Paper text:
In bacteria, the stressosome, a key inducer of the stress response is a very large nanomachine that responds to diverse environmental changes by triggering a protein partner-switching cascade of events, which culminate in the desequestration and activation of an alternative sigma factor.
In the latter map, the density for the C-terminal domain of RsbR is well defined, even for side chains, allowing the structure of this RsbR domain to be built. The total buried surface area of the interface between the RsbR STAS domains within the RsbR dimer is 1027.3 Α2 while that within the RsbS dimer is 657.6 Α2. This is in contrast with the fact that interfaces within RsbR and RsbS homodimers are formed by residues in β-strands. Therefore, this loop could adopt two conformations, one (closed) preventing RsbT access to T209 and one (open) allowing access.
Author numbering:
A (entry chain f), C (entry chain d), G (entry chain O): 1 to 118
B (entry chain HD), D (entry chain FD): 140 to 237, 251 to 275
E (entry chain W), F (entry chain Q), H (entry chain P): 148 to 237, 251 to 275
Write the structure that this text describes.
């Protein structure tokens, strides 16, 4: 009801608009893995460009859906992270390695198809 | 009377399809079955030691102890160098209070399983 | 708050989850045509697979942007029409000529990437 | 024996490798386990199905009824293609009061699985 | 006077830093990140040629050097002093000179300088 | 018992080790490190194929398979038995059989065999 | 005195003779870094073949000036560690990985030299 | 004690003999001949390069050297000492050291080594 999935030749996509609570994300966290069961995948591409502030528990969720989607087989790309979300709030207790971040959704595909699926 | 409990442990097969090794588990991942890994390891050095496929696609779900099931993935580096882990479930990976190789399915697992043994399946 | 529209390499992939009324339809109509001039584009892929019922006051709004975008300067394709909504489209009766729709969002981008900008 | 002897009826698996789908029958040899083929032929056409192994290489023995086992081997020519029968034991083939393709071992069945569907093992 | 620096050569932007030993200028990572996302940011330099020395916390400066990798692309500290590193109480890439720090940055975009 | 059984070919020194179940036999660490620079050889196979079991001495065993790497090429523990992988309460390269670890040994140090 | 630095072909075959004092190592620590800063190099070849006894702070200082000259931009190696000084590093839990040790000064030259251009 | 210092490589299966020069230890005849059929080894080394000297042993050590030629093939002694060859009233191919006995052993069974 606001979070679409528009899979594109074994490569999924994710748009994320402005969220306000972690009760949205728990209904969302099951929806991504329920899609990656229904179709085969090689890399999901999470796009968080439209977010300027992040709850610290939501950063635990968005830091988790990386590792929820690594075990299924697919890679992840957390593309288009803004400054103000990244600079002083992702200095928290993350372990972001092997994440393959990108700059924008057009170049975010070709940093994934250059690695996997081709 | 209790011949059901015997031949309940020894239903973790280790068929050798193309000689990496294969395996499959059903839904019984309780802590009493430590033979889910110690009966795949005693045979692992017996036959050829190249990559294992566990293929636990029907196992819903492990309870709270994956440190008998995901410590061995860092322990079949011993006597086998290797290990994968094929097709987890959503509520199964919902258990993450806290690397190794994983794959969506077996027919994509068996592709890169033959990459480590350096062989192709073509024509 | 709004219908999530992203962009891809020289294409736009708008996806529709659900609506409320004509007020959300004119707000989406103002969203897409502004964005296609807010940046440059040549092909719009409208995804309507998640809709099972459309009122006659709404199908003209999806009759507007399927023909107001061609005059704007980009070719359009409306992939994945459900069989329930496809009945009342022509039971009303409005030909989607020049639209060249497809069945799913993967095969929708096959023709549009081929036709303009090979 | 409340739910253990019925959960162990859901232990006649069908793992799904590369396009020939192979089975692993460990121990369910009595006449009451008719479902070793019923839970095969139903789930045969469910996924995309071609020639299917059985791999009963550790099993002793079928008692007096191969009607449920080897007569139905002619019945998976109907939905699927011509099934094999991998690695009978020496005490099993002695039971012949009374064809079908067979193979000595498990890896050699996959050597002629791909000879049917025109594939090889290269590199 | 609020000025830290910036430049913008061919594809990879990089940034100069002269000597300013304090912590209250956290703008040197704010004005870096609010402009790195504007243009198409790739690997960028720091060039601590004249900087002696940051006193007690370059943790703010060296953890944001990790956070450029999550924003766009990696970073490189070009030519630290012999006293700036002088005690290490706690990775990333580095180079000694700018003339070859730029050279193995164009390899990260796969470009070489022919005649 | 002065039993160490070096038996070293050209570059790869290796070892054959039966049951030696005491820390008083620490000399398989001492004589192995001293022989490592008495000949210039960089690969060391281990071959603990017949050894079961050990309880409180991997502190000699694993660390001597760790501090060869600061003096030579990496090592390989060959054929850890099935009653040995369970006792690991705490990496490197390793293998299964003795003749196939030797085939992997030359590949790391720029050599191969032909027929 | 005591610690010569040679500067041979963009390499520093610096040796270490029978020296013991941690205060000499502090006197040594500035001499290695201020040389490679003022004279731009790419790989330092330390040589500790003569030393057979070490203090705990020596393993910290030699644990520093490998990680120090790595941060200055030099793939520093350590050549010819004696057995008895390698014995007393299994108790003092130093973590000499990423230090690229070698065997002797002959093979330690080309091992670094293969890791730089040639 | 009861000990077999015999590794198990490929077809050049070799051995090692340290100082146990007493005739009661006949197991170096037993645990080599009885292990000889259990794995297919064509050529066979000894490497008795350490023990000095030998008085009542070597009739066993030369009947071993002619119960392998009739078992499979090509035993070879590797590196006898200087005192060890004083008065030997008792042929067999031999060599000088372990790294070069192997290359006269691979070349006997028509196998080669390149790079």
């Amino acid at each position: 009801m606001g979070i679409p999935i528009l899979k594109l030749g074994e490569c999924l996509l994710i748009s994320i608009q402005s969220e306000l609570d972690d009760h949205t994300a728990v209904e969302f966290q099951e929806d991504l893995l329920a899609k990656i069961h229904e179709t085969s995948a090689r890399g999901v591409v999470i796009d968080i460009t439209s977010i300027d502030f992040i709850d610290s528990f939501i950063a635990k969720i968005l830091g988790d859906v990386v590792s929820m989607s690594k075990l299924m087989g697919a890679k992840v790309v957390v593309t288009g992270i803004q400054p103000a979300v990244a600079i002083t709030l992702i200095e928290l207790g993350i372990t972001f390695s092997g994440v393959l971040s990108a700059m924008d959704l057009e170049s975010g595909l070709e940093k994934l198809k250059q690695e996997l699926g081709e | 009377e209790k011949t059901v409990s015997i031949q309940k442990s020894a239903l973790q097969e280790l068929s050798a399809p193309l000689l990496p090794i294969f395996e499959k588990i059903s839904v019984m991942p309780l802590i009493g079955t430590i033979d889910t890994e110690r009966a795949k390891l005693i045979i692992e050095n017996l036959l050829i030691g190249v990559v294992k496929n566990r293929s636990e696609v029907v196992l819903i779900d492990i309870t709270g102890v994956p440190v008998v099931d995901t410590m061995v993935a860092h322990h079949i580096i011993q006597a086998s160098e290797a290990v994968r882990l094929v097709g987890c479930q959503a509520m199964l990976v919902g258990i993450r209070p806290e690397q190794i190789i994983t794959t969506n399915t077996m027919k994509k697992g068996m592709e890169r399983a033959l990459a480590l043994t350096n062989r192709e399946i073509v024509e």
